[PDB]
Design a binder for these strands. Structure first.
Ligand SMILES: [Ca+2]
Ligand SMILES: [Cl-]
Ligand SMILES: [Zn+2]
Length: 187
DNA sequence: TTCT
């Protein structure tokens, strides 16, 4: 119920405009006797801790800051939950995050993970290996489409009554990215 | 204007 600023959302989740930051919206649902129950109190968003060598802050990618906060969610380890991420950059490999998320999932088997990425972080030369590894660890790895952008707008942004207005090129970029990811996950 |  801490809501994201409209301009922060549109300037970070635009799937044609890269930024030097990462934002991550998350939601948790519990699977019970077949159907799924939304746990609206476990909803939130965060961004990465920025690098700042000067001030001796080393910097922490958004995905690991989500892992940081899981204990506070107080999940029942006998139950099974689906955690959904809407992340403005896909997770990296070379800084260790994909592997850390895999280790978290192996240990925390009560969490299943669904990732929708706005953009592919191919700045990481080994970004393909992060995506395949997350898939191999049991996560759903997907590209955000209109439905997820609107859902994040409706759910996480302080819109004040304004309906989601898709930017130019939202569908074209989502489709192109969905094509690249599918090819990556075919292998 | 790619977790600067
Ligand atoms: Ca959805
Ligand atoms: Cl990452
Ligand atoms: Zn990372």
């Amino acid at each position: 119920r801490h809501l994201m600023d409209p301009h922060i959302f549109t300037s970070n989740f635009n799937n044609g405009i890269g930024r030097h930051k990462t934002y991550l919206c998350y939601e948790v649902e519990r699977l019970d006797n077949g159907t799924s129950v939304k746990m609206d109190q476990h909803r939130g968003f965060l961004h990465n801790q920025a690098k700042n060598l000067l001030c001796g802050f080393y910097g922490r990618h958004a995905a690991l800051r989500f892992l940081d906060l899981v204990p506070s969610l107080q999940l029942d380890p006998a139950q099974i939950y689906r955690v959904t991420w809407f992340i403005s950059w896909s997770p990296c490999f070379s800084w260790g995050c994909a592997g850390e998320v895999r280790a978290f999932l192996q240990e925390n088997t009560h969490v299943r993970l669904r990732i929708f990425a706005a953009r592919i972080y191919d700045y990481d030369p080994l970004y393909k290996e992060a995506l395949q590894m997350l898939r191999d660890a049991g996560a759903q790895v997907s590209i955000m489409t209109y439905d997820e952008f609107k859902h994040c707008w409706d759910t996480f942004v302080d819109h004040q009554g304004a309906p989601f207005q898709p930017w130019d090129g939202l569908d074209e970029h989502s489709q192109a990215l969905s094509g690249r990811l599918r090819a990556i996950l075919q292998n």
